[PDB]
Amino acid sequence: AVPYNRMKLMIVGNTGSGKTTLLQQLMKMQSATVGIDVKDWPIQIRDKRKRDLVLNVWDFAGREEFYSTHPHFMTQRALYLAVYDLSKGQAEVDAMKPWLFNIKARASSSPVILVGTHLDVSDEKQRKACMSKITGFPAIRDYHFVNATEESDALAKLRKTIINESLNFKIRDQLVVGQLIPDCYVELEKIILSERKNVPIEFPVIDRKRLLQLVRENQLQLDENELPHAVHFLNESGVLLHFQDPALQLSDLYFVEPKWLCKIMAQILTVHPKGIISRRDVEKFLSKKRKFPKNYMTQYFKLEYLLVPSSLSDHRPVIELPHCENSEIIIRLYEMPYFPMGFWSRLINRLLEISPPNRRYWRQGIYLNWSPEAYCLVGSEVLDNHPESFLKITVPSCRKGCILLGQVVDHIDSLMEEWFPGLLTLLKKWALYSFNDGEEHQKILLDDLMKKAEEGDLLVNPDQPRLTIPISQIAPDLILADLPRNIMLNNDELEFEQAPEFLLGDGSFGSVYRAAYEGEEVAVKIFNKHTSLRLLRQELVVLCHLHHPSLISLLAAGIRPRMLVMELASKGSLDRLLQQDKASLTRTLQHRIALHVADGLRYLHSAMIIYRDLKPHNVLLFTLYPNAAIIAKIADYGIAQYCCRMGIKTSEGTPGFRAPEVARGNVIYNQQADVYSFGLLLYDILTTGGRIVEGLKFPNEFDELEIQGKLPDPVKEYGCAPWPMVEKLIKQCLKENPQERPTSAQVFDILNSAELVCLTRRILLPKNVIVECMVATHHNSRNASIWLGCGHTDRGQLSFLDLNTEGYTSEEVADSRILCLALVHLPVEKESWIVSGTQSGTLLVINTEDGKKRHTLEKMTDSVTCLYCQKNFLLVGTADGKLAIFEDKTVKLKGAAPLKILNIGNVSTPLMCLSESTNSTERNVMWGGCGTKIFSFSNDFTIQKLIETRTAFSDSNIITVVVDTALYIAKQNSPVVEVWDKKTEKLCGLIDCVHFLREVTSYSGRVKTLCLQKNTALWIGTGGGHILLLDLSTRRLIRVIYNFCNSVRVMMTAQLGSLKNVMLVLGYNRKEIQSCLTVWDINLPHEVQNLEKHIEVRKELAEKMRRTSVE
Ligand SMILES: CCNc1nc(Nc2cc(F)c(C(=O)N3CCOCC3)cc2OC)ncc1C(F)(F)F
Ligand SMILES: Nc1nc2c(ncn2[C@@H]2O[C@H](COP(=O)(O)OP(=O)(O)O)[C@@H](O)[C@H]2O)c(=O)[nH]1
Secondary structure, eight states: OBOOOEEEEEEEEOTTSOHHHHHHHHOOOOOOOSSOOEEOOEEOOSSTTOOOEEEEEEOOOOOGGGGGGSTTTOOSSEEEEEEEESSSOHHHHHHHHHHHHHHHHHOSSSOEEEEEEOGGGOOHHHHHHHHHHHOOOOOEEEEOOOOSSSSOOOTTHHHHHHHHHTTSSOTTSOOTTTOOBOHHHHHHHHHHHHHHHHSOTTSOOBOHHHHHHHHHHTTOOOOTTHHHHHHHHHHHHTSSBOOOOTTTTTTSOBBSOHHHHTTHHHHHHTOOOSSOBOOOGGGSSSOOSSSSSSSTTGGGOOOOOBOOSTTSOOSOOSOOOSOOOTTTEEEEEEEESSOOTTHHHHHHHHTOOOOOOEEOOBTTBOOEEEETTEEEOOEEOOOSSSSSEEEEEEEESSHHHHHHHHHHHHHHHHHHHHTOOTTOOOOEEEEEEOSSTTSOOEEEOHHHHHHHHHHOSSOBOSSOTTOBOOSTTTOTTTTTOSSOTTSOOOGGGBOOOOOSTTBOOOOTTBOOEEEEETTEEEEEOOBOSSOOHHHHHHHHTTTTTOOOTTSOOEEEEETTTTEEEEEOOTTEESTTTSSSOGGGOOTTHHHHHHHHHHHHHHHHHTTTEEOOOOOSSSEEESOOOSSOSOOEEEOOOSSOEEOOSSOBOOOOOOTTSSOHHHHSTTSOBOGGGSHHHHHHHHHHHHTTTHHHHHHHSOHHHHHHTTTTOOOOOTTTSSOOOOOTTTHHHHTTTTOSSGGGSOOHHHHHHHHSOTTTTTOOEEEEOSTTOOEEEEEOOSOOSSOOEEEEEEOSSSSBOEEEEETTTTEEOOOOOBSSOEEEEEEEEETGGGEEEEEEEETTSOEEEEESSOSSOOOOBOOOSSOEEEOOOOOOEEEEEETTOEEEEEEGGGGSOSSOOOSOOEEOOOTTSOOOOOBOBSSTTOGGGOEEESSSEEEEOOTTOOOOEEEEOOOOTTSOOEEEEEESSSEEEEETTOSEEEEEOTTTOSEEEEEEHHHHHTTTOOOOOOOOEEEEOSSSBEEEEETTTEEEEEBSSSSOEEEEEOSSOSEEEEEEEEEETTEEEEEEEEEEOOOOOOOEEEEEOTTHHHHHHHHHHHHHHHHHHHHHHHHHHTO
């Protein structure tokens, strides 16, 4: 709680007025001030206990050219002077009036002194009357007309004033110098002083990390929670500058020397018509520790062939209207008292769109000429013999000019709705009509012409009814004549009813009743009585130009009852289907309704439009049939506003579905503040809308989640089944730093995957415990438990992961490394038993239910390499290839050998690829291999086929075999898989692995696992971490799957929750190993096709719509 006494002064001094001269004479070569020039000014008041008053003084430059960049520095908590000469007379105060008017809106809680200058040649008696009449214009406390350069002025009353304002001037009833601010704040300021000396001279900036390091490094005791509050406070007193604005993206940097930013305009001013200059090559001529000075972020200065408005000429150029007649041209008018500082800059910027041409943009008017058919001379014409100012648009009275005027007036009214609120009141529109051509123009304000037209669009001369002028060619914005002629109401062919029964939703400003239009069914959106035409145009700027097959469409629009006919969504909104038909949302439809909305948002954000209102009641469905082309459109663009790279300043949003910065409306967000609403939609789709009704209880609890943002784990509490690939969106596109969210194209891309609609679970075993052999549970009904054979320790462990609970309940039952496992499921006597094959060569046996039933079978001659489980025959393969046959009747027997060894090889030949077939169900076609030699056998235990494979990678032993109609053979470190036919016993195909991997990439394209789906496709798992979804048919590649693992160890097919079709996968993360277990849904090969055909369908739809729309 330390005292802090340092206020800021802003002498806004016009040119020639001697603001610098008065400051110099007050604070005890003066060519001009090129921009702001900040100084300090210490003083000690006469009172003994008077706080040390030091005024951070800004000697604001006053040439008109600089004005466009001024308002961004005029902030609150500052006493604005004003300086106008008196040798000019009553004209000088009139010329100073715009400055006071601009102060009146940029900061109106700031006291304003007002001081003349150069009283040596003044006539005070005249100007005193109008100066008193000045006291809309803010609280000009006290005029203090004073001398020029000598010392005969009591203007030091400023000090007096401010020390009164030390407690009179009250930001929220506080004291500007008496704020009991913590000592950590002042310590931050103290270290900022030295940081300004340490920071590069021509590159003043510090990052966040350095600030966070020095906070604790110098024992400040400052917490990270109040740290942004501390930054904001110091920015208020003006010792540093920080731009929280997400649209600017400069939230990372911190500016320590505010004396530098003020002069960047001056420097860049003097780095063919102006506003055209070469690339900003001067960005590297300085220190510039980046590819720009002080960071790469200079070019984001909202104050590359260059355009700058400040240096634009101030004379109306030599441009003549192609036509001249009262009948042939419309002219709109806006009556405004004072052009806000920085208007024409924003206007030129916004009107540098060329998609609604020889230009001629001067400092106070754009000009856009396509041809003698259509031009739009937006320009300032104060020549009215009146004090106020007129902004006038001029267009030719043909339909092309109407389509131009009706868009220019929307863009101007969006400028004046987002950036300049104070004007709208002061703003007063006008339309210029004339009955008999040649006579002068007669004006009528717009609020009256709108009603005169609503009554009837045949505007009558009040003097004599013999003259008639249609409201079309005088003001076609009001009667909706500037619209493509395909969309126009035809009320004869419309039969709506406003009755209660025929009602649908009620989306905020309006209602939507169903009706008939041409014979089909439609959704007539008649507006309320208290609704302005501006909202109609705000929706008809989006609904009549953009065409996309995931956005709602317009069938008509008319001004008589002010409706908007739109196509009907038969199946209902997303909310009314996420509260009733809960069980109709499968895992496919839940992804289609999130892909179509993402595509809609992509097309929106690609036309410079922000939606801002992505609720779950503005996602309409058309057909719940999971496999279609147009499932989910978007509707209710009631507050959708244009959004360039500059950003938006208003704050509209339904409480609970807003970005974190939208709620704190002080900052200016951008298009990427919408992806948060989409993430919230995705969180409300994943959990079947539980959050909706939970937020319905309390509006404060509904809005805290967009302010506090403590969202639960959706899989834990709400009960939803795990979707472990979309939970990487919901946990990514819900962040707090807007720069770190995925862009809309990048969240459409992540959602345009067949993996996401598949990876169905994902488990990570504990740190550095590894699996080498997996076996599922054949019961599939007791629970979802999958025993795993560990291999990390020298001894052998037998873990048992339980899939639904994720509890790794390992155990140590083996002495040596565990190599193979198998589950014998005999309903006879309820004998479900798991046996294993150790690297030592013993067949350990364990019962699932019995905690201790270790009936260790008679150990084989050598180690164990594989095992296989109607026919309940156990076929054990040793490293010698001495295949053994046990039996299921000896499950209780503790050590035995039921049948004889069918030895087919020696110790040199390792035998582990045993497999059966799904063709004809006859186990007699069991295949396999002993060493570098394939073989088969049957129940007769005879070798009915031995096919040696001795014919660089062609000299390796066998690993896996699968048999549906041919043979597939993998061998150790083989980029190929040697195919064989079971009829000719000859090698037919050679499916090269790395050849296929060449599209995604001493190549580690190994083959460490292999599986074969029933009759659809292969799953070839590569030791490099890829899953080759090879098509079984002839050669086609469905998809290669990667970027989730580093080495796939084992793969197999299992069953979960009494339903089949899951594909377990056990993978390495390569000495730190994180053994991972994905569980795919084996519908994946048919999915990659169905999804790709769907996408390719609607992309054709989107192109047929957009291309034809140009006509
Ligand atoms: C904001 C909703 N607007 C629309 N809504 C619809 N369709 C429906 C919306 C619904 F919600 C329900 C519904 O389930 N209801 C239950 C009772 O309460 C409301 C009606 C039924 C719909 O069509 C049959 N079509 C077009 C529109 C658009 F405005 F976009 F044109
Ligand atoms: N009329 C008049 N002008 C003065 C007097 N003393 C200084 N000036 C002018 O006032 C100017 C300073 O005005 P300033 O606010 O810095 O103008 P800016 O640089 O364009 O913003 C100097 O350039 C002087 O030429 C004076 O006694 N009478």
